[PDB]
Amino acid sequence: ERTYLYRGRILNLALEGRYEIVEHKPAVAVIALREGRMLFVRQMRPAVGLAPLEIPAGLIEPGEDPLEAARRELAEETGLSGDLTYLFSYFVSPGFTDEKTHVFLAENLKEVEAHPDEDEAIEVVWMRPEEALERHQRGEVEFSATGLVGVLYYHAFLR
Amino acid sequence: ERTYLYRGRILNLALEGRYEIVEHKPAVAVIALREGRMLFVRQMRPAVGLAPLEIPAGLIEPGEDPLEAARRELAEETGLSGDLTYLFSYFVSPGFTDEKTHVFLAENLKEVEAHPDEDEAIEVVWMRPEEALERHQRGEVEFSATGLVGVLYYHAFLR
């Protein structure tokens, strides 16, 4: 029942009667704790003009299931591997997009890929979740949904 | 620095160099607990083809601040008013959209508007958060980001 206005690289824009719909690939995100610090990442995000606090995340590529994508994103963004457990999923904004995010826990982390130079295209930000939440409350950092989900999951289940 | 491909009702689509960007109005969401039940809502969401478990939510309209929009959405979607406290915010998916959601807690709820007939355009779903999480784990219901945030916040801070 949909008409396409635009077919792009990570999204399509469609109209469905009165509804404006953005089709988007599904995503993964990985919650990881070590020594009381959560593994956050930051990168410049042109859609928002700032670098919010996120957790390792990205799009599921052709051929992959969510577990495999989660492994890949953890390795590509942080150089780590771990034992991954599926937690839950969510639709990021079901009033306009079908993007669905599958969230995993990672335990028993090991460095498998060295962090080249001082590369900060993706910045690795180990931070206690309590400190992330305080910084946010102070107006000092913004959250993505994945970062906030990580912080809340920690406070609910990992203390 | 942006070129517009489409200017719509709740969104615009723009390109910014290589980046596909969906501009979207900011949103609010309201977490409310009563007698151990969380106030969820469900509605058909054409972008996803199903009705996920959400919490009362919607777009900030012209003239409003987030607190006012939260009050309005609580009343319009559930017929309730309460004492609202700002909690935190998040970007729903900062890899492609600027939608930012401001989350509030509502306490001391009162019914101010009667629920007409048996109207289920927005369905009011009081449910224990533990039951929502079990149903999701069983594959029986999907979450929006707002619904999942509500469930996690409850488990972290409201028991």
Instruction: Nearest by CB to A144, from B13, B22, B90: name it.
Output: B90
Bridge partner list, A14: A4, A21
Nearest by Cα to B55 from B9, B89, B118, B105? B105
Bridge partner list, B42: B123
Q: What is the domain-level CATH number for residue A120?
A: 3.90.79.10
E strand or H helix at A106, and its extent? Answer: strand A100-111
Which amino acid belongs to residue B80?
Answer: L
- B45 to chain A, minimum CA–CA distance in Å? 6
Give the Cα separation of B21 and B89 in Å (integer): 20
Q: How far is CA B139 from the centre of its chain?
A: 21
Split into its structural domains, chain A has a count of 1
Q: Provide the angle, in degrees to the nearest 10, between the axes of the packed helices A145-157 and A129-137.
A: 130
Give the Cα separation of B3 and A148 in Å (integer): 31
Q: Given an 8 Å threshold on Cβ–Cβ distance, is B47 in contact with A142?
A: no
Q: Quote the tokens at residue B145.
A: 């980001």
Give the Cα separation of B47 and B96 in Å (integer): 16
E strand or H helix at A12, and its extent? Answer: strand A11-16
Q: Quote the tokens at residue B3.
A: 């070129």
What residues of A are in contact with residue B137 (Cβ under 8 Å)? 88
Residue in A closest to B144 by C-alpha: A91
Give the Cα separation of B44 and B101 in Å (integer): 20
- A134 to chain B, minimum CA–CA distance in Å? 10
Instruction: Nearest by CB to B155, from A8, A16, A157: name it.
Output: A157
What residues of B are in contact with residue A91 (Cβ under 8 Å)? 45, 48, 52, 142-145
The one-character DSSP state at B124 is E
E strand or H helix at B155, and its extent? Answer: helix B145-157
B118 an active-site residue?
yes
Four-residue CA torsion sign, A79, A38, A68, A82: positive
Count the helices and strands in chain B (H runs, E runs).
Answer: 3, 9
- B76 to chain A, minimum CA–CA distance in Å? 16
Nearest by Cα to A91 from A26, A16, A18, A156? A26
What residues of B are in contact with residue A54 (Cβ under 8 Å)? 94
User: What backbone phi and psi angles, to 5 degrees, belong to B56?
Assistant: -55, 135
Half-sphere exposure (CA, 13 Å, Cβ side) for B57? 30
Count the helices and strands in chain A (H runs, E runs).
Answer: 3, 9
Structural resolution in Å:
0.9
Which amino acid belongs to residue B100?
Answer: K
CA angle B148, A10, A150 (to 5 degrees): 25
Q: Quote the tokens at residue A96.
A: 């306009």
Give the Cα separation of B107 and A16 in Å (integer): 37
The annotation places the binding site of B at 20, 45, 61, 73, 77, 95
What residues of A are in contact with residue B129 (Cβ under 8 Å)? none
Nearest by Cα to A147 from A84, A109, A103, A115? A103
Q: Given an 8 Å threshold on Cβ–Cβ distance, is A91 in contact with B145?
A: yes
Method: X-ray
Q: Quote the tokens at residue B84.
A: 């609202």
Give the Cα separation of B24 and B12 in Å (integer): 7
Give the Cα separation of A79 and B117 in Å (integer): 57
Q: Which domain holds residue B20?
A: 1-159
- A58 to chain B, minimum CA–CA distance in Å? 9
Instruction: Nearest by CB to A90, from B19, B89, B145: name it.
Output: B145
Answer yes or no: are the C-beta atoms of B11 and A22 closer than 8 Å: yes
Q: Quote the tokens at residue A124.
A: 């690795």
CB environment A89-102: b (16+ within 10 A), e (fewer): bbbbbbbbbbbbbb
Give the Cα separation of B70 and B88 in Å (integer): 13
The residue written with tokens 């106030």 in the block is B39
The annotation places the binding site of A at 20, 45, 61, 73, 77, 95
β pairing state of A100-111 and A27-34: parallel
Q: Quote the tokens at residue A6.
A: 């635009």
Give the Cα separation of B76 and B122 in Å (integer): 9
The annotation places the binding site of A for Zn(2+) at 61, 73, 77
